[PDB]
Each structure stands twice: as C-alpha cells, then as structure tokens.
Design a binder for these strands. Structure first.
Ligand SMILES: [Zn+2]
Lengths: 183, 110, 96, 47, 101
RNA sequence: UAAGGGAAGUCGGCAAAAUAGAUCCGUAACUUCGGGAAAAGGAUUGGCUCUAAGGGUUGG
RNA sequence: UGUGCGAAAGGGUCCUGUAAGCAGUAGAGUAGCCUUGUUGUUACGAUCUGCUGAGGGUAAGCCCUCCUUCGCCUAGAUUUC
C-alpha cells in the first residue's frame, strides 16, 4: 500500500479514506474527505481557499525551496530489492525528518520576525493615549498613607509604591447589581 | 472548615446545559440551570438571582444565551423570622473581560 | 498496532482515544467484522462448538497496516508527530 | 552526505542561532488598558 | 438565477471543468473530441456558435456576442487568466515530484 | 432534506418538485384580423468608483 | 477517604475557515492644495496583502490530567423469614 495525498487540500489520504472521482478524459481525483469532494463539486478553487496547502504554497507560507524536499519522489524506475539499501533508507528518512523540522521552524520565525516591534509600537501609542486608566491609589488610601508617613517619619512616595504593588498583586473583579433588602 | 457566609466566583458552562433545547425555552431553562448550579454548589435550596444577571442571560433574546457566564454566588444567612431555610444564595453577574480561562475563586470578605 | 511492513511504533488507540470509550491499555483482541454489543459493553468470547469446515478458519492472517487515525471526525494522521510534521509550526508554538 | 555537509555549514554560519524591561512594562500596561476598555464596554452593554 | 438550484450539485448536472477548458483552448484536438462527444443537430444553433471559455453553445452570433459583454464570461476569463488548478500544482503544493530517470 | 435512477408508483403524475420580478434578443399554427402572446426558445441581474444625457433662475 | 464524585481549567482530538484592530509606493477612479506634476501631494475608495491554519466552538452520549484549582463525603426516610 501507499499514502496518497488529497487533490484538493493536500492532506495525507490513507486507505479507505475519502473518495475518488473518475473523469471521462482519463484523470482521477482522490479526495481525503467529503469537504474537499463537495468543494470540488461546487467548483471552488483550492488556491483561493485559505485552509489548503495549495493556498499556503501560493502565499509562500510553506517552505518550498529546501534540500530536504528533494528526497521524496514518485519513483517510476524500480530498484531491485536490497536489505541494506532499505535499512539505510529508513535511517535517512529519520534524519531528513529531523532536519526538515528544524529548517521549517527557522522559516516560520523568519516569517514572524517583525511582530515584537509592531506590538511595542502599538502598546506605546495605546499607553500614550490612555495614561489616565493606569492603576491608581484611592484618595482615602492616599490620605491614610500620608498620615501614616507623618506618624512614622517615612516616605509617602515609598508607601505609595508598595501600596501600588499590593493592589497590583490583588486583582478583584466587580459584580453587577446588588441585593435589595427586604422589609 | 468553610463558614456559612461565603462568596465564590464560578464559570458556568451553559452551552452543554442548553444543548438541543427548544428555542422558545432556552433562556428560561438557562435561568433554571443557574438556580440548579447554585443549589448544587452551596447546598441552599433558596437561590435568588440578580436582575442584572437576568439581563445578562436575556441580553441576546430568548435563544441567544451566552456559552459561558461568570457569576458570583454568595451564601448568606436568612435573618427573617419564620424562615424555613436559614441560608440562601444570592447570584450576581461578574464584570470580567472574557469569561474563558478562569478558575473557581473565593471572594475576599473585605 | 505496528506491523512488519509499517514500522511506525504506535498503540491500538486512535488519536483522541476511542470515542465514548477511552484508551486501550491492556491486551486486546482484534476481530474481523462486527460483534453484537455496543461500546463499553461486556462481550463473552467462546470457543467454537464444532470443528470448522471452511478454509477461512485455516487461513493465516498477515496484517500490513492498522488505522489509528481519529474517529471523532475525518482524521488524516496516524500520530501526533505526523500531525505536527504535516502542519508545521503554529502560533502557540512560538508563544510557548 | 551532502545534506550533512550543508547542515554543518549552516550550523557554523549560525542558521539555527536563536536570539527589554521597558518594553515588557509598556506591554503589560497596554494589556491593563485593554482590560479596562473591555470592562467599560461590558458596563455599557449591561446598561 | 440558476435553474433548479436544488439538484445543481448532482453528477447528472455536471459542467465542464476549467482545466479541460484550458486544454481545449491550447489544443484543438481536445475540443474536437469534446464536440464529437455531442450531437450537432441537437445543439443550440446547430453547434455553429460556441464559447470555448464558457464551454457553452448559443443560438445565434448575436446571442454569443451578447453573452461576451456579461459578467459570467468575464469571470471565466479572469479564472483562465489566473490558471486552473491541476495535478502538477497539487503536487508542487506538497513539494512532491516525479522521478522518471 | 435525501446518494444513484427519474413515473418503473397509482384507476389516474394525486401530492410534491420545477417556473416565477425586471432589462434585452426573439416569438408558430390558427383567427371573428380584435387576438393567440408573458406563446415557444434564449442573454443577463451583486458591490464599488466613475462618465454621459434629461431642468429652473440671474447676468449682457 | 477513594485509582472517589462534581464544577472549572489545561492539554489533546475534531468542525469552520483566517477574528477585532492597525498598517501598506496594492487598489479602478474622483476632488482639492501647491512644486502644476516628475509614486506631484493630500483626501475618499468595493476589494487585496501582512500581522493570522488565525479567531471561534469542542460533550451536551469525545479522550487524558493523585502530581492545575475549588468544593462534597461515613447521610436522611421507609421496609424486611
Ligand atoms: Zn482533502
């Protein structure tokens, strides 16, 4: 047996999975699932459906140029069976898989490099426009810190900073409404 | 170990409790499952809902009940004379940014 | 669930487990066809009362492959490693 | 063998080499601001 | 509007595909085979007025020049300009190939 | 709602499905010349950005 | 009193199909300001591209989780040679 691939989306097609369409010109179309089969019957383009490997290649979101992608091919010239060749092939398959995985991760990071700079710029703009929503001590808490600093001879700004630390550590959500007392 | 008067915040997954329910009955059943959840959590058969919690349930009509709702249930003492139940639960809706990703928490008394 | 021609090291349990059952961690019996019960149900296996008369009883079974894809949907992968290898890197992979 | 030679060449060149407190603080403050905006929108949706 | 939209996706209502349309445009022998598959006397306008892009027969030259101004013909032109989806593109999408020696 | 088939069903296509608005091409026999006729058979219809035509008053 | 039960949550597995928002010498054209055109410029503008197989849902008859949190427990009532 062998593992085929879906014509429409590109997923691995295993035995008894999906359905094959035989056309009168002599071409056969293997689909992994009824989703791909029904989209094909609705004449949707796989290149425009964003969940397909066709779209991902056309958008450049899959690693398409690599040395590790040259090892798998449809071999139309058979090789006489050789036990040593098959075992070294299996070892090659493992090593190729590992190398391909690391190179794919590098490719994804090179796609996603600029995110940190964009997010930092957006955060700076948001903070600059909304400085007034930053956490703040209560007026009663400020007065109590001021009188405690006057009593203990300590720094009111210092007391304010550890109180900001405490109210930053303690997160309390507010509830809607409230019970009405019965008569 | 746990006192009679106690408030906890819970996340009720109303989606699995309203799966397959008739459209004209989804929101009233949601009210009843909120009462049943509070009774199971606090042991109190007397459950009183906040009108804001009712608005939160009914916000998108009779069949647009949210999948998750973040509630605070407060078990309190019934001080009214001649009361069959000495304890009751009061359930309020909680203002959180997103009802997902939250654990059951105990509300501080202060 | 590994065979002599499929060298993938894997157990009989599908991805995501058996639907409404769980995971098979004990010895299991694979039976051609269907059986009278449902999932979770107690099955009684019995020896045949008579000597068999068919060649199918004397046939030796050689498995080439066992499906271990998910039965909670249209599963296309036999292992989670295969799913990761096909999909590639995700957003949560860099976030973690 | 060619793949292994290319791989060791790339590791020598730093192909697989992987790489601020002020940035972390400004991101945390932005997340706090977004949470406050969500709470304000929830109050409006309630009322 | 689409005539009998309920059974549009049946196999007995199937239309010619865009890759076959590309083959018909590039090679006249393929189009000749497709036309020999049909009977000319039962065709609209005796088969004399045919749009290869829309893979469709028309009753008159006025009708054919008429549909050419319409948007279905223009969407077919746009899809042909983009290119039909084929097996070699499907193979390149997964990075697979054929070794013929 | 239903794959494939498409009246094989039934006394009987009963019931259902199919058609349908508008613009344009086009429209037979028959006829009391008025009709038939929306006969039949076809092409098309979204969004957006534009262009053109269709008026009134004042001014030498 | 447990390899317990329940409510959440995390992970998985599936379904859909790429979220809000921001940005772009992408964008048919149109109108202003001036260097009167040299992406002239600014503005509007379906859509496209990137952030983004993302966002959302997931047991209600899916799976895993002494070792991610919180809670519950040795009852109550009735009957029996
Ligand atoms: Zn597929």
């Amino acid at each position: 047996m062998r593992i085929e691939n879906c014509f429409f989306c590109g997923r691995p097609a295993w035995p008894s999975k999906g359905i094959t369409f035989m056309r009168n010109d002599g071409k056969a179309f293997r689909f992994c699932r009824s989703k791909c089969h029904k989209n094909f019957k609705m004449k949707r383009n796989p290149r425009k459906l964003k969940w397909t490997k066709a779209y991902r290649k056309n958008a450049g979101k899959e690693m398409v140029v690599d040395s590790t992608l040259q090892f798998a091919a449809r071999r139309n010239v058979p090789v006489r069976y050789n036990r040593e060749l098959w075992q070294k092939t299996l070892k090659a398959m493992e090593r190729i898989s590992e190398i391909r995985a690391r190179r794919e991760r590098v490719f994804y990071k090179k796609r996603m490099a600029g995110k940190r700079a964009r997010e930092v710029a957006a955060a700076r703009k948001l903070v600059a426009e909304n400085e007034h929503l930053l956490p703040r001590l209560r007026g009663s808490e400020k007065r109590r810190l001021a009188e405690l600093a006057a009593e203990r001879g300590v720094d009111v700004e210092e007391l304010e900073r550890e109180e900001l630390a405490k109210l930053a550590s303690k997160k309390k959500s507010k509830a809607f409404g409230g019970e009405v007392r019965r008569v | 170990a746990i006192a009679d008067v106690v408030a906890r915040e819970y996340t009720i997954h109303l989606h699995k409790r309203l799966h397959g329910v008739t459209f004209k009955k989804r929101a009233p059943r949601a009210i009843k499952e909120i009462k049943k959840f509070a009774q199971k959590a606090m042991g109190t058969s007397d459950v009183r809902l906040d009108p804001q919690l009712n608005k939160k349930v009914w916000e998108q009509g009779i069949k647009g009940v949210p999948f998750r709702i973040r509630v605070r249930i407060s078990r309190r003492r019934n001080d009214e004379e001649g009361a069959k139940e000495k304890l009751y639960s009061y359930v309020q809706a909680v203002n959180v940014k997103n009802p997902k990703g939250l654990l059951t928490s105990v509300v501080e008394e202060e | 669930a590994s065979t002599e021609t499929d060298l993938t090291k894997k157990k009989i349990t599908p991805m995501g487990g058996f639907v409404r059952y769980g995971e098979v961690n004990n010895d299991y019996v694979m039976i051609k066809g269907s059986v009278p019960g449902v999932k979770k149900r107690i099955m009684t296996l019995r020896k045949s009362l008579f000597t068999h008369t068919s060649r199918k009883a004397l046939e030796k079974v050689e498995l080439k492959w066992i499906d271990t894809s998910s039965e909670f949907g249209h599963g296309a992968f036999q292992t989670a490693a295969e799913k990761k290898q096909f999909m590639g890197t995700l957003k949560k992979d860099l976030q973690t | 063998q060619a793949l292994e030679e290319e791989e060791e060449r790339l590791e020598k060149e730093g192909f697989y080499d992987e790489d601020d407190e002020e940035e972390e603080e400004i991101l945390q403050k932005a997340e706090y601001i977004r949470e406050q905006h969500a709470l304000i929108r929830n109050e409006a949706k309630m009322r | 509007g689409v005539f009998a939209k309920r059974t549009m996706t049946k196999t007995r209502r199937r239309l010619r595909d865009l890759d076959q349309i590309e083959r018909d445009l590039r090679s006249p022998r393929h189009l000749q085979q497709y036309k020999e598959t049909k009977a000319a006397e039962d065709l609209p306008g005796l088969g004399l007025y045919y749009c290869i892009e829309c893979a469709k027969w028309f009753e008159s030259e006025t009708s054919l020049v008429g549909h050419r101004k319409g948007k279905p013909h223009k969407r077919r032109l746009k899809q042909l300009k983009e290119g039909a989806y084929t097996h070699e593109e499907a193979m390149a999408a997964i990075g697979y190939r054929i070794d013929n020696g």
